[PDB]
Design a protein around this motif. Structure first.
Motif, PDB file in Angstrom:
ATOM      1  N   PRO A   1      76.416  22.466  54.724  1.00 51.12           N
ATOM      2  CA  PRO A   1      77.355  22.886  55.791  1.00 51.12           C
ATOM      3  C   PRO A   1      78.623  22.017  55.867  1.00 51.12           C
ATOM      4  O   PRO A   1      78.534  20.818  55.754  1.00 51.12           O
ATOM      5  CB  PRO A   1      76.553  22.769  57.096  1.00 51.12           C
ATOM      6  CG  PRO A   1      75.147  23.064  56.654  1.00 51.12           C
ATOM      7  CD  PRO A   1      75.059  22.389  55.298  1.00 51.12           C
ATOM      8  N   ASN A   2      79.764  22.662  56.105  1.00 51.35           N
ATOM      9  CA  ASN A   2      81.122  22.059  56.048  1.00 51.35           C
ATOM     10  C   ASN A   2      82.044  22.828  57.005  1.00 51.35           C
ATOM     11  O   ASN A   2      81.759  24.029  57.252  1.00 51.35           O
ATOM     12  CB  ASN A   2      81.643  22.117  54.612  1.00 51.35           C
ATOM     13  CG  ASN A   2      82.903  21.317  54.400  1.00 51.35           C
ATOM     14  OD1 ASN A   2      83.993  21.884  54.361  1.00 51.35           O
ATOM     15  ND2 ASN A   2      82.755  20.008  54.241  1.00 51.35           N
ATOM     16  N   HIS A   3      83.123  22.179  57.448  1.00 54.50           N
ATOM     17  CA  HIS A   3      84.224  22.706  58.306  1.00 54.50           C
ATOM     18  C   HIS A   3      84.844  23.958  57.673  1.00 54.50           C
ATOM     19  O   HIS A   3      85.381  24.807  58.403  1.00 54.50           O
ATOM     20  CB  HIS A   3      85.356  21.658  58.463  1.00 54.50           C
ATOM     21  CG  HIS A   3      85.012  20.427  59.227  1.00 54.50           C
ATOM     22  ND1 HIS A   3      84.730  19.240  58.606  1.00 54.50           N
ATOM     23  CD2 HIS A   3      84.921  20.192  60.560  1.00 54.50           C
ATOM     24  CE1 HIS A   3      84.433  18.327  59.514  1.00 54.50           C
ATOM     25  NE2 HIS A   3      84.548  18.890  60.733  1.00 54.50           N
ATOM     26  N   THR A   4      84.884  24.009  56.346  1.00 57.90           N
ATOM     27  CA  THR A   4      85.679  24.991  55.594  1.00 57.90           C
ATOM     28  C   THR A   4      84.759  25.974  54.882  1.00 57.90           C
ATOM     29  O   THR A   4      83.790  25.533  54.220  1.00 57.90           O
ATOM     30  CB  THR A   4      86.632  24.300  54.616  1.00 57.90           C
ATOM     31  OG1 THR A   4      87.410  23.389  55.394  1.00 57.90           O
ATOM     32  CG2 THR A   4      87.519  25.291  53.903  1.00 57.90           C
ATOM     33  N   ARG A  29      87.093  34.549  66.486  1.00 60.08           N
ATOM     34  CA  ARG A  29      86.063  34.506  67.558  1.00 60.08           C
ATOM     35  C   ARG A  29      85.070  33.369  67.295  1.00 60.08           C
ATOM     36  O   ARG A  29      84.355  33.000  68.237  1.00 60.08           O
ATOM     37  CB  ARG A  29      85.318  35.838  67.719  1.00 60.08           C
ATOM     38  CG  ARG A  29      84.454  36.202  66.534  1.00 60.08           C
ATOM     39  CD  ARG A  29      82.989  36.552  66.806  1.00 60.08           C
ATOM     40  NE  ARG A  29      82.702  37.568  65.798  1.00 60.08           N
ATOM     41  CZ  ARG A  29      81.529  38.072  65.462  1.00 60.08           C
ATOM     42  NH1 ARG A  29      80.420  37.641  66.029  1.00 60.08           N
ATOM     43  NH2 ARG A  29      81.488  38.982  64.499  1.00 60.08           N
ATOM     44  N   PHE A  30      84.965  32.851  66.065  1.00 61.70           N
ATOM     45  CA  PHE A  30      83.908  31.846  65.736  1.00 61.70           C
ATOM     46  C   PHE A  30      84.277  30.455  66.272  1.00 61.70           C
ATOM     47  O   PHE A  30      83.341  29.626  66.424  1.00 61.70           O
ATOM     48  CB  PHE A  30      83.593  31.826  64.236  1.00 61.70           C
ATOM     49  CG  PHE A  30      82.943  33.118  63.818  1.00 61.70           C
ATOM     50  CD1 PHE A  30      81.631  33.393  64.191  1.00 61.70           C
ATOM     51  CD2 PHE A  30      83.673  34.107  63.187  1.00 61.70           C
ATOM     52  CE1 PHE A  30      81.045  34.611  63.878  1.00 61.70           C
ATOM     53  CE2 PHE A  30      83.079  35.317  62.860  1.00 61.70           C
ATOM     54  CZ  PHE A  30      81.774  35.575  63.223  1.00 61.70           C
ATOM     55  N   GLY A  31      85.550  30.231  66.598  1.00 64.12           N
ATOM     56  CA  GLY A  31      86.078  28.901  66.970  1.00 64.12           C
ATOM     57  C   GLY A  31      87.511  28.705  66.510  1.00 64.12           C
ATOM     58  O   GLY A  31      88.058  29.603  65.834  1.00 64.12           O
ATOM     59  N   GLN A  32      88.099  27.543  66.817  1.00 64.32           N
ATOM     60  CA  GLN A  32      89.510  27.248  66.469  1.00 64.32           C
ATOM     61  C   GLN A  32      89.647  27.148  64.948  1.00 64.32           C
ATOM     62  O   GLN A  32      88.849  26.418  64.304  1.00 64.32           O
ATOM     63  CB  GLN A  32      89.990  25.983  67.182  1.00 64.32           C
ATOM     64  CG  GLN A  32      91.479  25.759  66.991  1.00 64.32           C
ATOM     65  CD  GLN A  32      91.948  24.439  67.560  1.00 64.32           C
ATOM     66  OE1 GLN A  32      91.302  23.869  68.445  1.00 64.32           O
ATOM     67  NE2 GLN A  32      93.084  23.962  67.053  1.00 64.32           N
ATOM     68  N   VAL A  55      82.200  22.237  62.386  1.00 65.09           N
ATOM     69  CA  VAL A  55      81.152  22.698  61.423  1.00 65.09           C
ATOM     70  C   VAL A  55      80.335  23.862  62.034  1.00 65.09           C
ATOM     71  O   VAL A  55      80.078  24.811  61.288  1.00 65.09           O
ATOM     72  CB  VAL A  55      80.226  21.556  60.945  1.00 65.09           C
ATOM     73  CG1 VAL A  55      79.169  22.087  59.993  1.00 65.09           C
ATOM     74  CG2 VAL A  55      80.989  20.420  60.266  1.00 65.09           C
ATOM     75  N   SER A  56      79.916  23.806  63.307  1.00 62.00           N
ATOM     76  CA  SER A  56      79.100  24.866  63.957  1.00 62.00           C
ATOM     77  C   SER A  56      79.826  26.223  63.866  1.00 62.00           C
ATOM     78  O   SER A  56      79.152  27.269  63.600  1.00 62.00           O
ATOM     79  CB  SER A  56      78.734  24.512  65.411  1.00 62.00           C
ATOM     80  OG  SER A  56      79.910  24.336  66.178  1.00 62.00           O
ATOM     81  N   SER A  57      81.139  26.221  64.086  1.00 62.05           N
ATOM     82  CA  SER A  57      82.009  27.424  63.960  1.00 62.05           C
ATOM     83  C   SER A  57      81.944  27.980  62.527  1.00 62.05           C
ATOM     84  O   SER A  57      81.753  29.197  62.362  1.00 62.05           O
ATOM     85  CB  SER A  57      83.410  27.109  64.351  1.00 62.05           C
ATOM     86  OG  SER A  57      83.469  26.688  65.698  1.00 62.05           O
ATOM     87  N   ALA A  58      82.054  27.114  61.520  1.00 64.97           N
ATOM     88  CA  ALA A  58      82.036  27.512  60.094  1.00 64.97           C
ATOM     89  C   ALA A  58      80.652  28.092  59.774  1.00 64.97           C
ATOM     90  O   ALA A  58      80.579  29.168  59.121  1.00 64.97           O
ATOM     91  CB  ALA A  58      82.385  26.330  59.204  1.00 64.97           C
ATOM     92  N   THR A  59      79.575  27.460  60.260  1.00 63.16           N
ATOM     93  CA  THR A  59      78.188  27.955  60.003  1.00 63.16           C
ATOM     94  C   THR A  59      78.019  29.362  60.606  1.00 63.16           C
ATOM     95  O   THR A  59      77.496  30.263  59.919  1.00 63.16           O
ATOM     96  CB  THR A  59      77.126  26.981  60.525  1.00 63.16           C
ATOM     97  OG1 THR A  59      77.315  25.795  59.755  1.00 63.16           O
ATOM     98  CG2 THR A  59      75.708  27.501  60.400  1.00 63.16           C
ATOM     99  N   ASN A  60      78.432  29.545  61.851  1.00 59.52           N
ATOM    100  CA  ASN A  60      78.264  30.851  62.534  1.00 59.52           C
ATOM    101  C   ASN A  60      79.118  31.925  61.843  1.00 59.52           C
ATOM    102  O   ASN A  60      78.608  33.063  61.675  1.00 59.52           O
ATOM    103  CB  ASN A  60      78.524  30.725  64.035  1.00 59.52           C
ATOM    104  CG  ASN A  60      78.046  31.942  64.813  1.00 59.52           C
ATOM    105  OD1 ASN A  60      77.101  32.642  64.399  1.00 59.52           O
ATOM    106  ND2 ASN A  60      78.703  32.209  65.938  1.00 59.52           N
ATOM    107  N   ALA A  61      80.344  31.569  61.414  1.00 51.94           N
ATOM    108  CA  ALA A  61      81.279  32.461  60.689  1.00 51.94           C
ATOM    109  C   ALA A  61      80.593  32.915  59.407  1.00 51.94           C
ATOM    110  O   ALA A  61      80.519  34.144  59.184  1.00 51.94           O
ATOM    111  CB  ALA A  61      82.595  31.788  60.397  1.00 51.94           C
TER     112      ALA A  61
END
Length: 91
Positions: A1-4, A29-32, A55-61
């Motif tokens: 898992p990563n930001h990108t 919608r997943f985050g900034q 990272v949580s936003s990238a995982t959900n995306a």
């Protein structure tokens, strides 16, 4: 898992500016989102990088949008690992 997240199998007929705007439309919608990187360099067509702040936003995306039909093509999503040489390994 990563930001990108690294997206491929994008419709190559779509112009860079519209592709970025449509990518914001479905991923915001997943985050900034800090940025969306798209290259029209030939071997980098069909691909995009979405940099989330968390990272949580990238995982959900990645989990929610896996296979999502976008311009009639199912997108393939993976985490971008730093120093993975995506471009140097690609032909």
């Amino acid at each position: 898992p990563n930001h990108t997240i690294y997206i491929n199998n994008l419709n190559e007929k779509i112009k860079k500016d519209e592709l970025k705007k449509s990518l914001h439309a479905i991923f915001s919608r997943f985050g900034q989102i800090l940025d969306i990187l798209v290259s029209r360099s030939l071997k980098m067509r069909g691909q995009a990088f979405v940099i989330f702040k968390e990272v949580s936003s990238a995982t959900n995306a990645l989990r929610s949008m896996q296979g999502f039909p976008f311009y009639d093509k199912p997108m393939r999503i993976q985490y971008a690992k730093t120093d993975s040489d995506i471009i140097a390994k690609m032909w």
